[PDB]
Amino acid sequence: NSTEISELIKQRIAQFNVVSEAHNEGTIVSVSDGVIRIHGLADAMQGEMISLPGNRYAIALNLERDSVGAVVMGPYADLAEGM
Amino acid sequence: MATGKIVQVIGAVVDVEFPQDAVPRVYDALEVQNGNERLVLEVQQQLGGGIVRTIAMGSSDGLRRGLDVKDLEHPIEVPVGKATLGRIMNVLGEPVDMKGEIGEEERWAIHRAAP
Amino acid sequence: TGKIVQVIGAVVDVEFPQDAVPRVYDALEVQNGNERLVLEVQQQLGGGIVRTIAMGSSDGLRRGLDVKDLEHPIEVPVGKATLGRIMNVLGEPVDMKGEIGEEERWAIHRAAPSYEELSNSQELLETGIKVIDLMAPFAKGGKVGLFGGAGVGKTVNMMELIRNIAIEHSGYSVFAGVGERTREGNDFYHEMTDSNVIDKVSLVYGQMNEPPGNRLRVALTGLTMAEKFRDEGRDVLLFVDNIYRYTLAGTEVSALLGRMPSAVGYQPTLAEEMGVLQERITSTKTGSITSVQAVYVPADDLTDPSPATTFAHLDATVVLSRQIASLGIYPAVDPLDSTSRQLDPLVVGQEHYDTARGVQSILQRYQELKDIIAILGMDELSEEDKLVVARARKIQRFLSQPFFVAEVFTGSPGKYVSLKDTIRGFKGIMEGEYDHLPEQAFYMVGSIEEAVEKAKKL
Amino acid sequence: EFITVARPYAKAAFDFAVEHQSVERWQDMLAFAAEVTKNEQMAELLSGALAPETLAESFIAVAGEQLDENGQNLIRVMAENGRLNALPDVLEQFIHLRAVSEATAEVDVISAAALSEQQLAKISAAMEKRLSRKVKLNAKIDKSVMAGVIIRAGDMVIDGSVRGRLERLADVL
Ligand SMILES: Nc1ncnc2c1ncn2[C@@H]1O[C@H](COP(=O)(O)OP(=O)(O)OP(=O)(O)O)[C@@H](O)[C@H]1O
Ligand SMILES: [Mg+2]
């Protein structure tokens, strides 16, 4: 009854369209004093340039288990959660 | 329409929760009805989950959890120009003398990039 | 088999199947773009997670990279095959010559020799430097530490010690560059090759450009080579370019390893990390290591935990003072702080001991008088206090000496001074035999005869 | 690991299931709530920064079987505090509480051979005497046991093996 419920779960996730981010893409989780926390970016690498909305970059300093910690190469005050 | 609600009040620090899709940006200005007077809050940090953390531009006493919060989408804006001459104002650009309203022509945001 | 799950600076976390988790200090391997990166295991966290330090640049690492588990610690070539070659922390050749003709490789993590194995020795080892073997002489098979701040002459003093000892000495030598200037390594390499003494020296270089793991482990690599030569039964010279950088590389990674800060922000394990390294540098009934170590003193603070911990581990300690160095007295040894286990009447004999303690007493009394002199000036002193000052100043000048490696800086020929000349000269100064010479006669003269010849021309 | 934060919820769920005489259903329900937690896409969502109630309603959407207003409300509680990844450890502590309440113990027996089954009758009687609980045996054959048998119950072990006796005598240097 385990395999059945496993595939039941996989059917029901699709029925509700819950799905992952694409690799090389993510969302800003939190913003403070120019430090940025990003969820996703499963293919980001240490020291990479992450392109933000607008025409600016953040530098990936930490690859945490659940997030990427990055610092903004410019003004940060216009950034927002969910970009 | 107010869209946020106060969720913590720890001294001057007020945390407000908004819908996931409408978190105010850093340095934006919020306002709440502290009883019978408006209190302005300035955004310092965007925490995860739609929560934002602010510093109260006024007395924090009397605030409850669950009060409605209005998101003014600009930073703190102050009157400027010739009308300001000879007038005393507070940080919010409100007259602290008794001499009536300031005949403003423009209001500028106080947060700016240098030339 | 393994998967990378975090990358924080120099620290990488790897997950393994729970039946296969690597041991502590196992070497792991991961392909980073177009190169191979070694990781050394530091801690086992729960659930098959293991926390490691990168032996190289960690930039460009993704999460989710496959990691290979090598079944052994970091192992380096040892023996005569290493002689005359420059090697990396991983035991790789760094000179442009071919592969190292190793016959054996040793793990760099080892236990110190047992209490039963240790050996005593009192054979005084002579140096060309007046102040060192007068005030803080040292024996064959002992440890010497040069303590000093930035730019006060630790390297120059160590190079003079190399020139004199490691060329009148006949056996092998190991030089470990730990977190110091690459330029100085290249200069040393060449002047060894031009002198054709290179074929007696093994050189391991972990200089400052390297990421923290290399600076952390390179000292252990050097000790492993020196231990191979010791256990063969030889008498060996080990030179460590700056021991402080090892503790500093511990400090840099300690926070990322999740360890609460201690004291001045140092790692809590500072004393143990220093002790396990230092205890392996020991002479033994089978063979003897003689060691000279430079010890950087941050912000000239001799009460900082790192110098303070280092002091207990050494037999002879020479303390270099910025205040003396700014007078231009070189070598800038402070004789009121420098000290040796060997300054003992039984080993040195009575004349040397009495001369050293007389010099120490006069200089201490001069320190006591300087605070009076600063406000009042010397004219208020007693006529015996003025004589104490007049002799102490000459003693301070006579401790200066021209070095051959300082021929390029000073422009004047270097001097080698026998111990007998030092004892005779300082005894003569303290007895007042030379009370009629000016102070300038004593500055930067090799021997007392040279002081009188300089005095004739002032 | 989640054990310490999972304990309070496990107690609350077991107590509620005792009052409403639904312990078996609750066990089968927590099994499903733990199993949905293990799915890839759901696990990615759990690591995200969704506000509690939106995450709770999406999870409840996937957890259709759950008894509405009891298990789904437990999901809402755990979603307020972000403990949903602890659900595999909120379960198994529920099972531990159940086994304690039912005064029943799983006990394990490891030997060099398949035991004679008459030996198992004696062993089960002995364990029901050592511990005042009904004892379920799930014994095993293991190559490492040179001879004899190991008895393990909870975190107490009674080594009757020849291997252990040897390495216990070899200790006497
Ligand atoms: N015996 C000496 N005679 C003349 N000058 C000297 C002597 N010793 C040192 N100096 C001067 O001090 C400078 C620095 O010397 P050195 O490189 O040995 O210092 P250090 O304390 O080991 O420094 P660092 O901490 O930067 O590695 C020399 O370049 C030289 O100018
Ligand atoms: Mg130096």
From TrEMBL, chain B:
<comment type="function">
    <text>Produces ATP from ADP in the presence of a proton gradient across the membrane. The catalytic sites are hosted primarily by the beta subunits.</text>
</comment>
<comment type="similarity">
    <text>Belongs to the ATPase alpha/beta chains family. T3SS ATPase subfamily.</text>
</comment>
<protein>
    <recommendedName>
        <fullName>ATP synthase subunit beta</fullName>
    </recommendedName>
</protein>
